[PDB]
Amino acid sequence: EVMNRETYKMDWSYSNSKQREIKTEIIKTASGSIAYCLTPDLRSPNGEDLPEMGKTSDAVYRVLLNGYPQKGPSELGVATTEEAHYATQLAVWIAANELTEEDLVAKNERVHNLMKRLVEASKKETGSQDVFFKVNPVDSQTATQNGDYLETGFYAVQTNAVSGSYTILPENAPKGLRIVNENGEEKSTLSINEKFKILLPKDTSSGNFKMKVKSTLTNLQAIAFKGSEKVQNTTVLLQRNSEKISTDLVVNWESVGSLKIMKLGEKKEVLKGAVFEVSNENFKQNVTTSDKGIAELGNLPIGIYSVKEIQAPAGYVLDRSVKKIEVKTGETAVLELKNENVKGELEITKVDVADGNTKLPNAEFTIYNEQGKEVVKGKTDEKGVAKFKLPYGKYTYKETIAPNGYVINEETFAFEIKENGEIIKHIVQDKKVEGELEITKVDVADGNTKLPNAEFTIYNEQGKEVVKGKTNEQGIAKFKLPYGKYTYKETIAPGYVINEEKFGFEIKENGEIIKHIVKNKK
Ligand SMILES: [Zn+2]
Ligand SMILES: [Zn+2]
Ligand SMILES: [Zn+2]
Ligand SMILES: [Zn+2]
Protein backbone atom coordinates (compact mmCIF):
# COMPACT_ATOMS: atom_id res chain seq x y z
CA GLU A 1 0.00 0.00 0.00
CA VAL A 2 1.04 3.62 -0.81
CA MET A 3 1.34 5.80 2.35
CA ASN A 4 0.51 9.47 2.98
CA ARG A 5 1.41 11.95 5.81
CA GLU A 6 -0.02 14.79 7.96
CA THR A 7 1.68 16.91 10.70
CA TYR A 8 0.25 18.33 13.97
CA LYS A 9 1.09 20.44 17.04
CA MET A 10 1.67 18.61 20.34
CA ASP A 11 3.35 18.87 23.74
CA TRP A 12 6.07 16.41 22.62
CA SER A 13 7.85 14.27 25.22
CA TYR A 14 11.63 14.74 25.61
CA SER A 15 14.21 11.89 25.49
CA ASN A 16 17.20 12.41 27.82
CA SER A 17 19.41 9.89 25.95
CA LYS A 18 18.71 11.19 22.42
CA GLN A 19 18.64 14.84 23.65
CA ARG A 20 15.65 15.88 21.52
CA GLU A 21 11.86 16.08 21.44
CA ILE A 22 10.22 12.82 20.26
CA LYS A 23 7.88 13.78 17.37
CA THR A 24 5.72 12.06 14.73
CA GLU A 25 3.07 12.57 12.02
CA ILE A 26 -0.25 10.85 11.18
CA ILE A 27 0.46 8.32 8.43
CA LYS A 28 -2.49 7.17 6.26
CA THR A 29 -2.71 4.44 3.57
CA ALA A 30 -4.32 4.96 0.13
CA SER A 31 -7.60 3.37 1.36
CA GLY A 32 -7.62 5.78 4.35
CA SER A 33 -6.65 3.67 7.38
CA ILE A 34 -4.02 4.91 9.87
CA ALA A 35 -0.56 3.30 9.94
CA TYR A 36 1.92 3.54 12.80
CA CYS A 37 5.72 3.79 12.65
CA LEU A 38 7.93 1.04 14.18
CA THR A 39 10.94 3.24 15.13
CA PRO A 40 11.49 6.92 16.12
CA ASP A 41 14.97 6.96 14.46
CA LEU A 42 14.11 6.88 10.71
CA ARG A 43 11.69 9.15 8.78
CA SER A 44 8.16 8.16 7.73
CA PRO A 45 7.37 7.37 4.05
CA ASN A 46 5.86 9.82 1.55
CA GLY A 47 4.19 8.24 -1.51
CA GLU A 48 6.22 5.00 -1.61
CA ASP A 49 4.90 1.45 -2.29
CA LEU A 50 5.80 -0.63 0.82
CA PRO A 51 5.85 -4.50 0.64
CA GLU A 52 4.64 -6.91 3.39
CA MET A 53 7.33 -8.54 5.58
CA GLY A 54 5.14 -10.42 8.09
CA LYS A 55 3.74 -9.36 11.46
CA THR A 56 4.80 -7.34 14.49
CA SER A 57 4.98 -8.90 17.97
CA ASP A 58 1.79 -9.68 19.95
CA ALA A 59 2.83 -6.89 22.40
CA VAL A 60 2.72 -4.25 19.65
CA TYR A 61 -0.49 -5.87 18.31
CA ARG A 62 -2.16 -5.44 21.71
CA VAL A 63 -1.34 -1.69 21.74
CA LEU A 64 -3.17 -1.25 18.40
CA LEU A 65 -6.24 -3.25 19.61
CA ASN A 66 -6.56 -0.98 22.66
CA GLY A 67 -5.50 2.39 21.13
CA TYR A 68 -6.42 4.98 18.49
CA PRO A 69 -8.28 4.72 16.12
CA GLN A 70 -9.95 1.41 17.23
CA LYS A 71 -11.21 3.58 20.12
CA GLY A 72 -11.81 7.34 20.04
CA PRO A 73 -10.39 10.04 22.36
CA SER A 74 -13.29 10.26 24.88
CA GLU A 75 -13.30 6.46 25.37
CA LEU A 76 -9.48 6.42 25.78
CA GLY A 77 -9.45 9.29 28.33
CA VAL A 78 -7.84 12.17 26.33
CA ALA A 79 -9.15 15.43 24.85
CA THR A 80 -8.23 15.32 21.13
CA THR A 81 -7.47 12.92 18.28
CA GLU A 82 -3.91 14.29 18.23
CA GLU A 83 -3.41 13.33 21.92
CA ALA A 84 -4.95 9.90 21.28
CA HIS A 85 -2.68 9.34 18.27
CA TYR A 86 0.54 10.51 19.97
CA ALA A 87 0.13 8.36 23.10
CA THR A 88 -0.61 5.34 20.86
CA GLN A 89 2.57 5.89 18.79
CA LEU A 90 4.67 6.22 21.99
CA ALA A 91 3.21 2.97 23.41
CA VAL A 92 3.90 1.23 20.09
CA TRP A 93 7.58 2.30 20.36
CA ILE A 94 7.79 1.20 24.02
CA ALA A 95 6.24 -2.23 23.29
CA ALA A 96 8.68 -2.61 20.35
CA ASN A 97 11.72 -1.85 22.65
CA GLU A 98 12.68 1.33 20.72
CA LEU A 99 12.14 3.55 23.81
CA THR A 100 11.96 3.06 27.59
CA GLU A 101 9.53 4.90 29.89
CA GLU A 102 12.19 6.26 32.28
CA ASP A 103 14.08 7.88 29.35
CA LEU A 104 11.03 10.04 28.43
CA VAL A 105 9.83 13.27 30.07
CA ALA A 106 6.13 13.96 29.51
CA LYS A 107 4.67 17.44 28.87
CA ASN A 108 0.95 16.46 28.95
CA GLU A 109 -0.64 14.30 31.68
CA ARG A 110 -3.59 13.15 29.57
CA VAL A 111 -1.02 11.83 27.05
CA HIS A 112 1.08 10.34 29.90
CA ASN A 113 -2.01 8.65 31.46
CA LEU A 114 -3.10 6.99 28.18
CA MET A 115 0.49 5.83 27.38
CA LYS A 116 0.64 4.03 30.73
CA ARG A 117 -2.74 2.35 30.11
CA LEU A 118 -1.80 1.09 26.63
CA VAL A 119 1.62 -0.19 27.78
CA GLU A 120 0.07 -2.02 30.78
CA ALA A 121 -2.43 -3.67 28.36
CA SER A 122 0.42 -4.86 26.07
CA LYS A 123 2.03 -6.61 29.08
CA LYS A 124 -1.11 -8.00 30.85
CA GLU A 125 -3.75 -8.96 28.28
CA THR A 126 -3.33 -12.11 26.17
CA GLY A 127 -4.77 -11.39 22.69
CA SER A 128 -2.71 -13.06 19.94
CA GLN A 129 -2.26 -13.02 16.16
CA ASP A 130 -1.98 -16.86 16.10
CA VAL A 131 -5.33 -18.10 14.74
CA PHE A 132 -7.09 -20.33 17.32
CA PHE A 133 -9.70 -22.89 16.21
CA LYS A 134 -11.26 -25.82 18.13
CA VAL A 135 -14.57 -27.76 18.13
CA ASN A 136 -15.96 -28.74 21.56
CA PRO A 137 -16.64 -31.46 22.45
CA VAL A 138 -13.59 -33.33 21.15
CA ASP A 139 -14.49 -36.96 22.08
CA SER A 140 -16.81 -39.18 20.04
CA GLN A 141 -20.46 -38.60 20.94
CA THR A 142 -23.47 -40.90 21.36
CA ALA A 143 -26.96 -39.87 20.17
CA THR A 144 -29.94 -40.67 22.46
CA GLN A 145 -33.70 -40.64 21.82
CA ASN A 146 -35.81 -37.50 22.21
CA GLY A 147 -39.25 -38.14 20.73
CA ASP A 148 -39.05 -38.56 16.94
CA TYR A 149 -35.24 -38.19 16.70
CA LEU A 150 -31.99 -39.54 18.09
CA GLU A 151 -29.94 -36.47 19.03
CA THR A 152 -26.51 -35.39 20.31
CA GLY A 153 -25.80 -32.43 22.58
CA PHE A 154 -24.68 -29.06 21.19
CA TYR A 155 -21.24 -28.59 19.61
CA ALA A 156 -19.44 -25.18 19.65
CA VAL A 157 -16.62 -23.43 17.72
CA GLN A 158 -14.03 -21.87 20.07
CA THR A 159 -11.93 -19.17 18.29
CA ASN A 160 -10.10 -15.81 18.72
CA ALA A 161 -11.52 -14.57 15.39
CA VAL A 162 -13.68 -11.40 15.26
CA SER A 163 -16.14 -12.98 12.81
CA GLY A 164 -16.50 -16.05 10.61
CA SER A 165 -18.64 -18.93 9.42
CA TYR A 166 -18.35 -22.72 9.27
CA THR A 167 -19.90 -25.68 7.45
CA ILE A 168 -20.55 -29.26 8.58
CA LEU A 169 -19.35 -31.97 6.19
CA PRO A 170 -20.65 -35.44 7.17
CA GLU A 171 -19.12 -38.57 5.53
CA ASN A 172 -21.54 -41.41 4.59
CA ALA A 173 -24.17 -40.35 7.14
CA PRO A 174 -27.64 -41.93 7.49
CA LYS A 175 -30.71 -40.83 5.52
CA GLY A 176 -32.79 -38.01 7.06
CA LEU A 177 -29.92 -36.34 8.98
CA ARG A 178 -30.74 -32.81 10.16
CA ILE A 179 -28.47 -30.18 11.69
CA VAL A 180 -29.98 -27.48 13.94
CA ASN A 181 -28.86 -24.52 16.08
CA GLU A 182 -30.15 -23.55 19.57
CA ASN A 183 -33.30 -21.89 18.11
CA GLY A 184 -34.18 -25.10 16.22
CA GLU A 185 -33.33 -23.56 12.82
CA GLU A 186 -32.13 -26.10 10.19
CA LYS A 187 -28.68 -25.09 8.87
CA SER A 188 -25.52 -26.71 7.49
CA THR A 189 -23.61 -23.37 7.27
CA LEU A 190 -23.57 -21.30 10.50
CA SER A 191 -21.98 -18.21 12.07
CA ILE A 192 -19.12 -18.88 14.57
CA ASN A 193 -21.27 -17.59 17.47
CA GLU A 194 -23.92 -20.32 16.81
CA LYS A 195 -23.92 -23.88 18.17
CA PHE A 196 -25.11 -27.00 16.32
CA LYS A 197 -26.76 -30.35 17.11
CA ILE A 198 -27.22 -33.58 15.10
CA LEU A 199 -30.64 -35.22 14.62
CA LEU A 200 -31.27 -38.70 13.13
CA PRO A 201 -34.67 -40.43 12.67
CA LYS A 202 -35.16 -42.83 15.62
CA ASP A 203 -35.85 -45.69 13.17
CA THR A 204 -32.20 -45.94 12.04
CA SER A 205 -30.23 -49.16 12.62
CA SER A 206 -27.25 -49.01 15.01
CA GLY A 207 -24.15 -47.41 13.50
CA ASN A 208 -21.73 -44.49 13.28
CA PHE A 209 -20.29 -41.83 10.98
CA LYS A 210 -17.51 -39.22 10.84
CA MET A 211 -17.89 -35.50 10.11
CA LYS A 212 -15.60 -32.49 9.65
CA VAL A 213 -16.12 -28.80 10.46
CA LYS A 214 -14.71 -26.47 7.75
CA SER A 215 -14.50 -22.73 8.59
CA THR A 216 -13.50 -19.36 7.15
CA LEU A 217 -12.27 -17.04 9.94
CA THR A 218 -11.50 -13.31 10.07
CA ASN A 219 -8.78 -12.29 12.61
CA LEU A 220 -7.34 -8.84 13.32
CA GLN A 221 -3.58 -8.79 12.64
CA ALA A 222 -0.81 -6.17 12.90
CA ILE A 223 0.79 -6.55 9.47
CA ALA A 224 4.33 -5.16 9.02
CA PHE A 225 5.63 -3.33 5.92
CA LYS A 226 9.30 -3.12 4.88
CA GLY A 227 10.94 0.30 4.53
CA SER A 228 13.88 1.02 2.28
CA GLU A 229 15.94 1.16 5.52
CA LYS A 230 16.48 4.84 5.11
CA VAL A 231 12.67 5.02 5.66
CA GLN A 232 11.00 3.36 8.64
CA ASN A 233 9.08 0.09 8.72
CA THR A 234 5.35 0.57 9.41
CA THR A 235 2.37 -1.37 10.81
CA VAL A 236 -1.34 -1.47 9.94
CA LEU A 237 -4.06 -3.27 11.93
CA LEU A 238 -6.07 -5.25 9.34
CA GLN A 239 -8.69 -8.00 9.00
CA ARG A 240 -7.22 -11.16 7.37
CA ASN A 241 -9.11 -14.33 6.31
CA SER A 242 -7.92 -17.85 6.97
CA GLU A 243 -9.22 -21.39 6.14
CA LYS A 244 -9.38 -24.07 8.90
CA ILE A 245 -10.66 -27.66 9.13
CA SER A 246 -11.20 -29.95 12.17
CA THR A 247 -10.08 -33.56 12.59
CA ASP A 248 -12.78 -36.22 12.20
CA LEU A 249 -15.61 -36.00 14.77
CA VAL A 250 -17.37 -39.33 15.41
CA VAL A 251 -21.10 -39.80 16.13
CA ASN A 252 -22.52 -43.23 17.12
CA TRP A 253 -25.82 -44.75 18.32
CA GLU A 254 -27.59 -47.95 19.36
CA SER A 255 -31.17 -48.77 18.22
CA VAL A 256 -33.10 -51.54 20.02
CA GLY A 257 -36.61 -52.54 21.15
CA SER A 258 -38.62 -55.48 22.54
CA LEU A 259 -41.20 -58.14 21.65
CA LYS A 260 -43.97 -59.41 23.98
CA ILE A 261 -45.90 -62.56 22.89
CA MET A 262 -49.26 -63.03 24.71
CA LYS A 263 -50.80 -66.52 24.44
CA LEU A 264 -54.57 -67.21 24.74
CA GLY A 265 -57.01 -70.14 24.45
CA GLU A 266 -60.45 -70.28 22.78
CA LYS A 267 -61.81 -68.25 25.70
CA LYS A 268 -59.52 -65.44 26.95
CA GLU A 269 -57.26 -67.43 29.33
CA VAL A 270 -53.51 -67.63 30.07
CA LEU A 271 -51.51 -70.47 28.44
CA LYS A 272 -48.16 -71.91 29.65
CA GLY A 273 -45.76 -74.11 27.64
CA ALA A 274 -46.18 -72.70 24.09
CA VAL A 275 -42.73 -72.57 22.39
CA PHE A 276 -42.09 -70.00 19.64
CA GLU A 277 -39.13 -69.41 17.29
CA VAL A 278 -38.34 -65.67 17.10
CA SER A 279 -36.03 -65.04 14.15
CA ASN A 280 -34.70 -62.90 11.37
CA GLU A 281 -31.42 -62.57 9.46
CA ASN A 282 -28.74 -62.25 12.19
CA PHE A 283 -30.99 -63.72 14.97
CA LYS A 284 -32.71 -66.92 16.14
CA GLN A 285 -34.12 -67.90 19.55
CA ASN A 286 -36.75 -70.33 20.88
CA VAL A 287 -38.76 -68.83 23.78
CA THR A 288 -41.34 -70.55 26.02
CA THR A 289 -44.39 -68.85 27.56
CA SER A 290 -44.61 -68.36 31.34
CA ASP A 291 -47.12 -68.52 34.26
CA LYS A 292 -49.05 -65.53 32.78
CA GLY A 293 -48.92 -66.60 29.09
CA ILE A 294 -46.10 -64.12 28.36
CA ALA A 295 -42.83 -64.58 26.44
CA GLU A 296 -40.48 -61.55 26.28
CA LEU A 297 -37.28 -60.54 24.49
CA GLY A 298 -35.32 -57.31 25.07
CA ASN A 299 -32.41 -55.54 23.33
CA LEU A 300 -33.49 -56.65 19.85
CA PRO A 301 -31.90 -54.73 16.94
CA ILE A 302 -34.76 -52.85 15.21
CA GLY A 303 -36.45 -54.39 12.13
CA ILE A 304 -38.83 -57.12 10.93
CA TYR A 305 -38.99 -60.38 12.96
CA SER A 306 -40.71 -63.69 12.13
CA VAL A 307 -42.63 -65.57 14.86
CA LYS A 308 -43.54 -69.26 14.49
CA GLU A 309 -45.02 -71.76 16.98
CA ILE A 310 -42.80 -74.91 17.13
CA GLN A 311 -44.39 -76.81 20.06
CA ALA A 312 -47.98 -76.36 21.28
CA PRO A 313 -49.11 -76.43 24.95
CA ALA A 314 -50.67 -79.41 26.74
CA GLY A 315 -53.89 -80.26 24.87
CA TYR A 316 -53.78 -77.48 22.24
CA VAL A 317 -53.51 -77.46 18.42
CA LEU A 318 -50.18 -76.62 16.76
CA ASP A 319 -50.34 -73.69 14.31
CA ARG A 320 -47.14 -73.41 12.22
CA SER A 321 -48.28 -70.28 10.30
CA VAL A 322 -45.59 -67.55 10.35
CA LYS A 323 -46.30 -64.14 11.95
CA LYS A 324 -44.46 -60.90 10.99
CA ILE A 325 -43.86 -58.01 13.42
CA GLU A 326 -41.77 -54.79 13.47
CA VAL A 327 -39.58 -53.91 16.46
CA LYS A 328 -39.17 -50.11 16.63
CA THR A 329 -36.68 -47.95 18.59
CA GLY A 330 -37.63 -47.71 22.28
CA GLU A 331 -40.93 -49.61 21.93
CA THR A 332 -42.32 -53.04 22.85
CA ALA A 333 -44.23 -54.57 19.94
CA VAL A 334 -47.04 -56.82 21.27
CA LEU A 335 -48.24 -59.98 19.49
CA GLU A 336 -51.46 -61.45 20.95
CA LEU A 337 -52.21 -65.02 19.75
CA LYS A 338 -55.25 -67.31 20.25
CA ASN A 339 -55.00 -71.16 20.34
CA GLU A 340 -57.59 -73.86 19.49
CA ASN A 341 -58.46 -76.75 21.89
CA VAL A 342 -57.80 -80.29 20.65
CA LYS A 343 -61.23 -81.88 19.96
CA GLY A 344 -62.23 -85.37 18.73
CA GLU A 345 -64.91 -88.07 18.86
CA LEU A 346 -65.80 -91.54 20.24
CA GLU A 347 -67.96 -93.81 18.04
CA ILE A 348 -69.43 -96.86 19.82
CA THR A 349 -71.18 -99.54 17.72
CA LYS A 350 -73.31 -102.07 19.69
CA VAL A 351 -73.68 -105.68 18.44
CA ASP A 352 -74.73 -109.23 19.40
CA VAL A 353 -71.78 -111.43 20.53
CA ALA A 354 -73.16 -114.38 18.49
CA ASP A 355 -73.73 -112.32 15.28
CA GLY A 356 -71.46 -109.31 14.56
CA ASN A 357 -73.84 -108.04 11.82
CA THR A 358 -76.84 -107.58 14.23
CA LYS A 359 -76.89 -103.91 15.42
CA LEU A 360 -78.57 -103.11 18.79
CA PRO A 361 -80.44 -99.83 19.50
CA ASN A 362 -81.20 -98.07 22.81
CA ALA A 363 -78.11 -99.31 24.72
CA GLU A 364 -76.85 -96.52 27.05
CA PHE A 365 -73.17 -95.72 27.56
CA THR A 366 -71.82 -93.36 30.24
CA ILE A 367 -68.39 -91.69 29.91
CA TYR A 368 -66.02 -90.81 32.79
CA ASN A 369 -62.91 -88.55 32.96
CA GLU A 370 -59.47 -89.25 34.56
CA GLN A 371 -60.67 -88.47 38.12
CA GLY A 372 -63.84 -90.57 37.52
CA LYS A 373 -66.59 -87.90 37.30
CA GLU A 374 -69.52 -88.56 34.93
CA VAL A 375 -69.04 -86.38 31.81
CA VAL A 376 -71.89 -87.48 29.46
CA LYS A 377 -74.47 -90.24 28.68
CA GLY A 378 -75.98 -91.36 25.38
CA LYS A 379 -77.98 -94.18 23.76
CA THR A 380 -77.33 -96.13 20.56
CA ASP A 381 -79.34 -95.10 17.46
CA GLU A 382 -81.42 -97.22 15.00
CA LYS A 383 -78.15 -98.66 13.53
CA GLY A 384 -76.55 -99.35 16.95
CA VAL A 385 -74.22 -96.30 16.81
CA ALA A 386 -73.63 -93.81 19.66
CA LYS A 387 -71.50 -90.69 18.90
CA PHE A 388 -69.72 -88.49 21.49
CA LYS A 389 -67.78 -85.27 20.66
CA LEU A 390 -65.14 -84.78 23.41
CA PRO A 391 -62.13 -82.55 24.27
CA TYR A 392 -58.48 -83.55 24.92
CA GLY A 393 -57.72 -86.07 27.70
CA LYS A 394 -58.02 -89.68 28.90
CA TYR A 395 -61.42 -91.25 29.68
CA THR A 396 -63.30 -94.49 30.43
CA TYR A 397 -66.80 -95.79 29.54
CA LYS A 398 -69.30 -98.50 30.67
CA GLU A 399 -72.64 -99.90 29.53
CA THR A 400 -75.20 -98.49 32.02
CA ILE A 401 -78.48 -99.62 30.36
CA ALA A 402 -78.49 -102.89 28.41
CA PRO A 403 -80.44 -103.06 25.15
CA ASN A 404 -83.86 -104.77 25.39
CA GLY A 405 -83.46 -108.56 25.90
CA TYR A 406 -79.69 -108.67 26.61
CA VAL A 407 -77.40 -109.31 29.59
CA ILE A 408 -75.58 -106.11 30.61
CA ASN A 409 -71.88 -105.90 29.66
CA GLU A 410 -69.89 -105.39 32.87
CA GLU A 411 -66.48 -104.38 31.40
CA THR A 412 -64.88 -100.90 31.60
CA PHE A 413 -63.28 -99.65 28.36
CA ALA A 414 -60.65 -96.90 27.99
CA PHE A 415 -59.61 -94.37 25.32
CA GLU A 416 -57.77 -91.03 24.83
CA ILE A 417 -58.36 -87.98 22.62
CA LYS A 418 -54.76 -87.26 21.49
CA GLU A 419 -54.91 -85.69 18.01
CA ASN A 420 -57.32 -83.01 16.68
CA GLY A 421 -60.25 -84.32 14.61
CA GLU A 422 -59.45 -87.93 15.61
CA ILE A 423 -62.36 -90.43 15.58
CA ILE A 424 -61.93 -93.52 17.78
CA LYS A 425 -64.14 -96.44 16.67
CA HIS A 426 -64.92 -99.23 19.17
CA ILE A 427 -67.18 -102.34 19.00
CA VAL A 428 -68.96 -103.61 22.15
CA GLN A 429 -70.50 -107.11 22.31
CA ASP A 430 -73.65 -108.27 24.17
CA LYS A 431 -75.01 -111.68 25.28
CA LYS A 432 -78.64 -112.40 24.34
CA VAL A 433 -81.11 -113.71 26.92
CA GLU A 434 -81.80 -117.39 26.06
CA GLY A 435 -83.72 -120.03 28.05
CA GLU A 436 -85.26 -123.53 28.04
CA LEU A 437 -88.79 -125.00 28.29
CA GLU A 438 -89.04 -128.58 29.66
CA ILE A 439 -92.53 -130.18 29.52
CA THR A 440 -92.83 -133.46 31.48
CA LYS A 441 -95.90 -135.33 30.16
CA VAL A 442 -97.49 -137.78 32.64
CA ASP A 443 -100.83 -139.64 32.77
CA VAL A 444 -103.54 -138.00 34.94
CA ALA A 445 -104.19 -141.31 36.75
CA ASP A 446 -100.63 -142.62 37.18
CA GLY A 447 -97.98 -140.11 38.31
CA ASN A 448 -94.45 -141.30 37.46
CA THR A 449 -95.34 -142.87 34.09
CA LYS A 450 -93.78 -141.84 30.75
CA LEU A 451 -95.59 -140.83 27.56
CA PRO A 452 -93.60 -140.63 24.28
CA ASN A 453 -95.03 -139.32 20.97
CA ALA A 454 -96.99 -136.38 22.52
CA GLU A 455 -96.27 -133.37 20.29
CA PHE A 456 -96.34 -129.83 21.69
CA THR A 457 -96.27 -126.65 19.59
CA ILE A 458 -94.95 -123.28 20.75
CA TYR A 459 -96.27 -119.89 19.53
CA ASN A 460 -94.95 -116.35 20.01
CA GLU A 461 -96.69 -113.23 21.44
CA GLN A 462 -98.16 -112.45 18.00
CA GLY A 463 -99.30 -116.09 17.56
CA LYS A 464 -97.03 -117.48 14.80
CA GLU A 465 -95.48 -120.97 15.16
CA VAL A 466 -91.81 -121.20 16.21
CA VAL A 467 -90.94 -124.85 17.03
CA LYS A 468 -92.52 -128.34 17.17
CA GLY A 469 -91.34 -131.30 19.27
CA LYS A 470 -92.58 -134.75 20.30
CA THR A 471 -92.00 -136.07 23.83
CA ASN A 472 -88.70 -137.93 23.84
CA GLU A 473 -88.53 -140.51 26.65
CA GLN A 474 -89.77 -140.28 30.27
CA GLY A 475 -92.41 -137.84 28.92
CA ILE A 476 -89.78 -135.05 28.52
CA ALA A 477 -89.61 -132.55 25.60
CA LYS A 478 -86.88 -129.83 25.65
CA PHE A 479 -87.05 -126.49 23.76
CA LYS A 480 -84.31 -123.82 23.71
CA LEU A 481 -85.76 -120.34 22.96
CA PRO A 482 -84.78 -116.64 23.08
CA TYR A 483 -86.25 -113.93 25.38
CA GLY A 484 -89.98 -113.16 25.14
CA LYS A 485 -93.56 -114.10 26.00
CA TYR A 486 -94.99 -117.30 24.51
CA THR A 487 -97.98 -119.65 24.55
CA TYR A 488 -98.21 -123.42 23.93
CA LYS A 489 -100.64 -126.28 23.28
CA GLU A 490 -100.72 -130.05 22.70
CA THR A 491 -101.06 -131.00 18.99
CA ILE A 492 -100.75 -134.82 18.91
CA ALA A 493 -101.91 -137.17 21.70
CA PRO A 494 -99.57 -139.81 23.22
CA GLY A 495 -104.38 -143.80 22.76
CA TYR A 496 -105.27 -140.62 24.68
CA VAL A 497 -107.54 -137.58 24.20
CA ILE A 498 -105.84 -134.24 23.44
CA ASN A 499 -105.52 -131.76 26.33
CA GLU A 500 -106.49 -128.53 24.51
CA GLU A 501 -105.66 -126.03 27.30
CA LYS A 502 -103.72 -122.94 26.15
CA PHE A 503 -100.75 -122.66 28.55
CA GLY A 504 -98.42 -119.62 28.79
CA PHE A 505 -94.86 -118.78 29.86
CA GLU A 506 -92.13 -116.11 29.62
CA ILE A 507 -88.35 -116.41 29.08
CA LYS A 508 -86.79 -113.43 30.93
CA GLU A 509 -83.48 -114.62 32.51
CA ASN A 510 -80.45 -116.19 30.78
CA GLY A 511 -79.82 -119.92 31.41
CA GLU A 512 -83.33 -120.32 32.88
CA ILE A 513 -85.16 -123.69 32.74
CA ILE A 514 -88.98 -123.50 32.96
CA LYS A 515 -90.34 -126.93 34.04
CA HIS A 516 -94.07 -127.49 33.31
CA ILE A 517 -96.31 -130.59 33.82
CA VAL A 518 -99.22 -131.26 31.43
CA LYS A 519 -101.50 -134.30 31.93
CA ASN A 520 -103.49 -136.47 29.49
CA LYS A 521 -106.86 -138.21 29.72
CA LYS A 522 -109.20 -140.51 27.81
ZN1 LIG B 1 -8.27 -3.99 26.59
ZN1 LIG C 1 3.11 12.45 34.13
ZN1 LIG D 1 -11.21 -38.12 26.31
ZN1 LIG E 1 -75.33 -89.55 37.46
Numbering used by the authors: 4 to 497, 499 to 526
Quoted from the paper:
An increasing number of surface‐associated proteins identified in Gram‐positive bacteria are characterized by intramolecular cross‐links in structurally conserved thioester, isopeptide, and ester domains (TIE proteins). TEDs are predicted at the distal end of a large number of surface proteins from Gram‐positive bacteria, and the name TIE (thioester, isopeptide, ester) proteins have been introduced for this family. Internal thioester bonds, formed between Cys and Gln side‐chains and first identified in the second thioester domain (TED) of the Streptococcus pyogenes minor pilin Cpa,3 play a negligible role in protein stability, but are suggested to mediate covalent bacterial adhesion. Structures of Bacillus anthracis, vancomycin‐resistant Staphylococcus aureus, and vancomycin‐resistant Enterococcus faecium TEDs show a head domain with Class I topology extended by a β‐sandwich; the latter contributes the thioester bond‐forming Gln via a β‐hairpin insertion into the head domain.
Its experimental molecular mass (58,441 Da) was determined by ESI‐MS as 70 Da lighter than predicted, consistent with the formation of a single thioester bond (evolving one molecule of ammonia) and three isopeptide bonds (evolving two molecules of ammonia and one water molecule). The crystal structure of BaTIE was determined to 2.58 Å resolution using Se‐SAD phasing and standard refinement approaches. The BaTIE ASU contains seven bound metal ions in three unique sites. The third site is coordinated by Asp142 and Gln144 side‐chains belonging to two neighboring ASUs, and two water molecules. It is likely these are zinc ions derived from the crystallization condition and are unlikely to be biologically significant, given that crystal packing is a prerequisite for co‐ordination. These static adhesion assays strongly suggest that BaTIE does not interact with Collagens I–IV or gelatin.
